[PDB]
Design a protein around this ligand. Structure first.
Ligand code: CHL
Ligand code: CLA
Ligand code: CLA
Ligand code: CLA
Ligand code: CLA
Ligand code: CLA
Ligand code: CLA
Ligand code: CLA
Ligand code: CLA
Ligand SMILES: CC(/C=C/C=C(C)/C=C/[C@@]12O[C@]1(C)C[C@@H](O)CC2(C)C)=C\C=C\C=C(C)\C=C\C=C(C)\C=C\[C@@]12O[C@]1(C)C[C@@H](O)CC2(C)C
Lengths: 197, 67, 98, 42, 307, 212
């Protein structure tokens, strides 16, 4: 499905069946098919978590600057005092993430294994493809068409690099992302990476 | 405003004439060589299906005159 | 080739005055049906200069001024302006567009 | 040039080219970042 | 594989004989990539995709059929007297060698006793050609009514018009009983604004809306009895789509009157997409009676002028 | 009409009376048999070296133009303080390092498309398709195209294609050497090329490289 470098050919292991299959495997990582179907899931989950992360560390900032709601800037957001401790959050984020991630693990190991509740055994999940559970993960029931999966993976690949840009625009700049965007739009030819270094 | 209208017409209808002559040189293969045949706007008919970039250029020109 | 293949003719040229359409239609009170007029509508043939090449695109030396003039008429069409240093807003505009 | 690229592909010529490039890299790094004993960039 | 026998006997360069799910079938492919799905041993066409756009995907489906039901969908020719004459599925090819790559022709042949119905489906680069020819052998003048009912799917339901049956009188007349129908003649004239008998009205519009149930036969075959000028209705019209910018044209040869059938709002009870129209010429309001031995020629051509 | 016919074996050589090598038959433009060392032995690599020569020469031609024409304008009184070997040190916006990375981005796109042409000819095709119109398949380095052959001079309109490509290559080899002269005699004289020309034309005898 398309090609990322027209001078290069899509490898034989990327047949275009998968969503987002522009043939980008220059370093031959998904050459074994097991690695391919594992890295599909790793891409989907890193991209979905990156979308949530970017949306949770940028949208706070574009609302802080305009003054709609004041909220911290994602790096001074840890040191704030919350209704629990700094580690209690880690305890909960371990207890009820181990359960959901090991069930996703059992799904990406064998697909039809884990779809019904432990407690309410009637409320099963439909037999969707791996990495796309559906059911209560689809309450509005927007269809998982291949174009939608491609849109998912594209926004996710974009949000991953956006998070990387955030980490490196706080590691060697010191300021937030949206402040860096306003600094770029102030004078684009004088507020870039090749002025900081 | 007179000079600005001069500029935009002189860059618009010039494009329109070059699109018309591209229409004409496309029609020369159909009708042979005759101005009552290869310049007759009646039997031109439709050329969107055949010459697309001429269509886009002529359309941007005629919208440049249609305002 | 025709619609019947090997029927109705070995092909027909010199199609005659088929006013009756070979239906043996008889005439009521009228002026004339047949006369001394024997005129065959001899049509032209097939399978000769058959191609009739559809109008393809001209070469690069025709499109290239048209592309540059497209870039002009898109660029000039939006010209804090240079109206004074070089040398009713919605209603009049929507009236002209209307 | 045919059969010169095969000679330059040979293990000693290729090793001296690789280690000359690598040694120049290390040498210019030590010019840029001399006297290094820690990695403080994290 | 009887189609393999037809392939190594009569198969040619643009002729591909196909046999899947024990159905004989042929696909005609002229040089410009025009597809024609003719179901063999049935005299029934399923699909037709001639090059409309100038892409590689210039081919566009014209005839309406659903994916599974080959007996319910597409143009099928029908002969009655007043019962169905050609319902026997004994159709076999007669000759195929017509032209190399530019124009093709599959002519079928059957026999209904006194009637030797051989039947031509041709593929030209701009036109489907559907040609019926019967031939009497017994000592009986048959009073037959031919019929070629086509089902042209439209992409948008609002875009339906025929563009050119103005001036000639029409009569709402229920169609022929085909084995390859989409709507029966009982529901084709039910819940309209034309009345059920052959009432007469003069069409005073250059294009007709096919939004309602109102289905009719164009022409005046009661005028044909006078054999004056009798206002012979035109043998051509521009059926349109308007969902996307293409059109088609139907040309009759040998027939006299031309039927259209508008499904109206009753297309929902069989199909769900691509509203169609039941259009074709018949010799119905005045039948044809050939001879005790002669032959009759009647042809129909659906053509496109986009290419 | 458009075939790229080569030069004959009895063509003019760089060194008359010498034997041209067997890997320089004449398929390339400007083939005069120049190979004292024989760097173009492997033809799969001689193709890359022909593309190298072509692009090198085109850049050198644009460069010698951008050096001598603007110096003529400076002598005419249009541009101030012009000196090409100090025109990178002088002031602009964007610090000359933001300019460099923007240049690397844009030229990376352009030269990457050209690279994809070189590795596999039909990958990055341009001059968009037209109905019943067969855009001719071009050669590497001479894409033709609506963008690079808008006057349609590449298929052989004014002159044959081989002599025009030879014109490109010879004019451009001359420009490559002109730019080497620029890079050398602007540092061993610390002066202007056109100034050096007028200085040698003043007294050709004693105003040569041996004075300095
Ligand atoms: C993923 C992830 C990343 C990239 C960071 C990044 C950071 N956290 Mg952090 N955290 C992350 C998950 C989590 N954090 C926290 C709770 C905290 C706290 C309580 C603090 C950080 C702090 C930090 C900073 C450490 C230097 C850095 C900005 C420190 C900081 O922001 O200092 C100003 C800090 O005090 N994080 C929780 C809940 C347990 C996480 C899950
Ligand atoms: C979590 C990271 C991650 C993972 C696991 C994948 C995994 C995959 N990608 Mg995706 N992709 C990602 C991020 C990721 N991608 C991002 C951020 C981009 C934009 C730069 C892309 C752009 C992209 C395209 C355009 C295409 C793929 C394709 C693929 C598949 C084959 C390549 C492969 O196995 O890579 C495995 C990758 C890793 C193991 C990640 C290593 C990351 C290192 C540690 C960081 C290197 C950068 C560093 C920060 C500097 C596979 C499903 C192809 C596909 O759809 O085939 C089905 C395809 O066409 N990807
Ligand atoms: C994924 C993800 C994660 C891990 C976080 C994590 C956090 N968010 Mg963010 N957020 C996200 C997505 C995410 N957000 C998205 C998608 C939106 C939209 C927001 C909008 C948002 C707002 C408006 C606020 C937070 C706040 C917070 C903090 C407290 C949340 C809580 O439970 O109390 C915490 C740092 C709160 C905070 O830091 O201030 C107390 C806060 O006010 N978030
Ligand atoms: C995801 C896309 C994305 C976008 C839109 C931006 C946008 C921006 N970045 Mg960030 N950045 C990104 C990714 C991105 N960056 C990544 C992946 C890295 C790690 C290599 C960085 C590291 C980085 C630094 C260190 C700095 C910026 C800065 C900037 C700003 C000026 C541009 C510049 O200096 O170019 C730098 C651009 C790159 C190094 C790579 C861009 C590649 C993207 C993915 C292509 C998008 C098209 C601008 C707001 C500067 C600032 O704060 O102002 C600055 O100092 N960026
Ligand atoms: C095995 C034992 C040993 C160890 C542990 C060390 C360790 C060290 N020596 Mg000693 N040394 C040794 C043996 C050893 N040496 C011997 C045998 C000799 C005699 C030949 C010397 C003679 C010697 C001298 C004379 C000097 C050192 C110096 C150093 C320091 C190196 C600083 C430097 O340039 O690195 C910097 C780092 C690099 C060069 C590595 C760069 C690698 C490249 C750029 C790739 C990395 C990026 C990569 C892409 C990944 C990025 C992640 C992601 C984005 C992809 C370091 C403490 C120097 C010093 O500072 O003194 C303390 C110094 O002056 N050593
Ligand atoms: C970018 C430089 C470059 C490159 C790659 C080529 C490549 C080519 N030339 Mg062209 N040529 C060039 C510059 C170049 N030329 C210039 C500047 C001149 C005029 C002086 C010529 C004159 C010329 C003639 C007359 C002919 C060729 C021919 C050829 C082909 C065979 C030779 C070969 O493979 O050499 C590969 C060359 C290189 C890889 C570059 C050499 C790099 C090394 C390191 C030496 C550089 C130092 C140099 C000697 C410094 C100059 C010192 C100064 C005092 C003069 C090949 C297509 C023959 C042909 O068939 O034409 C198509 C032919 O007959 N060339
Ligand atoms: C090889 C192509 C090439 C390259 C890399 C350059 C590069 C440059 N030119 Mg040159 N130039 C070129 C071709 C080229 N030019 C040609 C073909 C013409 C005609 C000119 C005419 C020209 C003028 C008239 C001027 C430049 C200037 C400049 C500088 C700023 C350009 C920006 O803005 C930069 C050093 C400007 C400058 O700052 O020079 C000092 C300037 O005044 N150039
Ligand atoms: C992982 C994602 C990824 C990466 C790393 C690249 C990287 C690249 N692309 Mg690709 N590309 C991608 C995704 C990607 N692309 C996708 C998803 C599409 C849509 C199908 C394309 C379509 C595309 C085209 C059409 C072209 C590139 C080109 C390029 C090159 C730009 C040269 C440069 O550095 O300019 C700064 C570079 C090698 C250009 C190139 O040089 O191709 C060889 C080019 O012409 N890309
Ligand atoms: C004066 C030197 C010169 C000459 C004779 C040519 C000659 C040619 N080039 Mg080359 N070319 C040159 C310089 C030159 N080029 C430079 C400097 C560049 C870089 C911008 C290019 C980039 C280039 C491309 C990308 C393409 C050509 C093409 C062509 C062919 C048709 C155009 C033509 O006749 O140009 C006539 C030139 C002139 C009359 C020079 C005056 C122009 C002034 C300065 C304006 C022909 C073989 C095309 C081709 O071969 O298509 C099949 C093609 O695709 N050339
Ligand atoms: C999951 C993820 C980010 C998740 C972020 C989250 C939850 C953020 C949360 C927070 O911000 C909030 C909301 C609020 C703050 O108060 C708290 C924190 C906690 C800070 C990023 C993944 C980020 C992943 C990244 C950047 C991965 C990049 C990978 C690349 C470029 C891969 C390239 C290749 O692998 C391919 C594709 C194919 C190979 O063949 C070739 C190569 C070239 C090797």
């Amino acid at each position: 499905k398309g090609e990322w470098l027209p001078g290069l050919a899509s490898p034989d292991y990327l047949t275009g069946s998968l969503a987002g299959d522009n043939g980008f495997d220059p370093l031959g990582l998904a050459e074994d098919p097991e690695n391919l179907k594992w890295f599909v899931q790793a891409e989907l989950v890193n991209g979905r978590w990156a979308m949530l992360g970017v949306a949770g560390m940028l949208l706070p900032e574009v609302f802080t600057k305009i003054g709609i709601i004041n909220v911290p800037e994602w790096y001074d957001a840890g040191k704030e005092q919350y209704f629990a401790s700094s580690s209690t959050l880690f305890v909960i984020e371990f207890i009820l993430f181990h359960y959901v991630e090991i069930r996703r693990w059992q799904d990406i190991k064998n697909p039809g294994s884990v779809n019904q509740d432990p407690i309410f055994k009637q409320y099963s999940l439909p037999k969707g493809e791996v990495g796309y559970p559906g059911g209560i993960f689809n309450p509005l029931n927007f269809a998982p068409t291949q174009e939608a999966k491609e849109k998912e993976l594209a926004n996710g690949r974009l949000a991953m690099l956006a998070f990387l840009g955030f980490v490196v625009q706080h590691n060697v700049t010191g300021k937030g992302p949206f402040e860096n965007l306003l600094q770029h739009l102030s004078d684009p030819w004088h507020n870039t990476i090749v002025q900081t270094f | 405003s007179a000079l600005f209208h001069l500029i935009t017409h002189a860059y618009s209808k010039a494009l329109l004439f070059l699109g018309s002559g591209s229409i004409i040189h496309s029609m020369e293969a159909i009708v042979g060589y005759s101005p009552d045949k290869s310049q007759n706007m009646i039997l031109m008919g439709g050329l969107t299906k055949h010459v697309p970039i001429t269509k886009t250029a002529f359309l941007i020109g005629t919208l440049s005159l249609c305002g | 080739l025709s619609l019947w293949g090997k029927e109705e003719e070995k092909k027909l040229t010199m199609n005659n005055t088929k006013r009756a359409s070979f239906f043996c239609n008889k005439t009521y009170k009228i002026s004339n049906n047949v006369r001394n007029q024997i005129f065959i509508t001899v049509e032209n043939f097939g399978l000769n200069t058959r191609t009739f090449y559809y109008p393809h695109e001209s070469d690069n030396t025709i499109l290239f001024p048209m592309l540059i003039l497209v870039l002009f008429t898109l660029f000039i069409g939006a010209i804090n302006q240079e109206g004074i240093d070089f040398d009713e807003f919605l209603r009049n505009a929507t009236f002209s567009v209307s | 040039m045919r059969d010169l690229k095969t000679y330059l592909s040979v293990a000693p010529v290729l090793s001296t080219l690789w280690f000359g490039s690598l040694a120049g890299l290390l040498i210019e790094i030590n010019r840029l970042f001399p006297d290094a004993l820690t990695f403080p960039f994290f | 594989i009887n189609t393999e026998k037809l392939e190594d006997k009569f198969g040619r360069k643009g002729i591909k004989f196909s046999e899947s799910n024990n159905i004989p079938m042929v696909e005609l492919k002229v040089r410009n990539g025009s597809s024609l799905k003719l179901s063999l041993s049935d005299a029934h066409v399923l699909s037709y995709k001639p090059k409309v756009y100038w892409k590689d995907e210039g081919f566009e489906e014209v005839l309406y059929t659903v994916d599974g039901d080959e007996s319910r969908g597409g143009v099928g020719v029908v002969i009655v007297n007043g019962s169905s004459v050609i319902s026997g599925c004994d159709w076999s090819v007669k000759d195929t060698d017509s032209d190399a790559i530019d124009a093709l022709q599959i002519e079928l042949s059957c026999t209904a006793g006194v009637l030797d119905i051989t039947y031509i489906v041709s593929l030209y680069p701009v036109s489907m050609a559907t040609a019926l020819v019967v031939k009497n052998n017994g000592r009986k003048p048959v009073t037959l009514k031919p019929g070629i009912m086509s089902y042209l799917r439209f992409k948008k339901r609002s875009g339906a018009g025929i563009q050119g049956l103005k001036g000639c009188s029409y009569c709402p007349n229920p169609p022929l009983s085909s084995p390859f129908e989409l709507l029966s003649p009982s529901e084709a004239m039910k819940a309209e604004e034309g009345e059920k008998p052959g009432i007469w009205a003069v069409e005073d519009s250059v294009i007709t809306l096919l939004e309602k149930k109102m289905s009719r036969i164009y022409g005046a075959p009661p005028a044909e009895r006078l054999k004056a000028v009798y206002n012979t209705p035109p043998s051509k019209f521009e059926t349109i789509d308007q969902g996307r910018g293409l059109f088609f044209r139907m040309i009759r040869i040998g027939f006299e009157e031309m039927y259209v059938g508008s499904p109206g709002s009753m297309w929902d009870k069989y199909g769900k997409q691509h509203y169609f129209v039941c259009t074709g010429p018949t010799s119905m309001l005045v039948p044809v009676d050939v001879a005790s031995g002669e032959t009759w020629r009647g042809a129909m051509v659906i053509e496109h002028d986009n290419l | 009409s458009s075939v790229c016919e080569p030069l004959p074996p009895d063509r003019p050589l760089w060194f008359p009376g010498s034997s041209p090598p067997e890997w320089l038959d004449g398929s390339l433009p400007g083939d005069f048999g120049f190979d004292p060392l024989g760097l173009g032995s492997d033809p799969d690599t001689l193709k890359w070296f022909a593309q190298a020569e072509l692009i090198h020469s085109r850049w050198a031609m644009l460069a010698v133009t951008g050096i001598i024409i603007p110096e003529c304008l400076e002598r005419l009184g249009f541009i101030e303080n012009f000196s090409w070997y100090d025109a990178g040190s002088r002031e602009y916006f964007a610090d000359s390092t933001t300019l460099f990375v923007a240049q690397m981005v844009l030229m990376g796109w352009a030269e990457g498309r050209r690279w994809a042409d070189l590795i596999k000819p039909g990958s990055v095709d341009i001059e968009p398709k037209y109905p019943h119109k067969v855009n001719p398949k071009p050669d590497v380095g001479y894409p033709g195209g609506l963008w690079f052959d808008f006057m349609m001079w590449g298929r052989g309109s004014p002159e044959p294609v081989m002599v025009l490509r030879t014109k490109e290559i010879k004019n451009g080899r001359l420009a490559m050497l002109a730019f080497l002269g620029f890079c050398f005699q602007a540092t061993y004289t610390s002066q202007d090329p056109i100034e050096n020309l007028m200085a040698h034309l003043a007294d050709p005898g004693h105003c040569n490289v041996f004075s300095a």
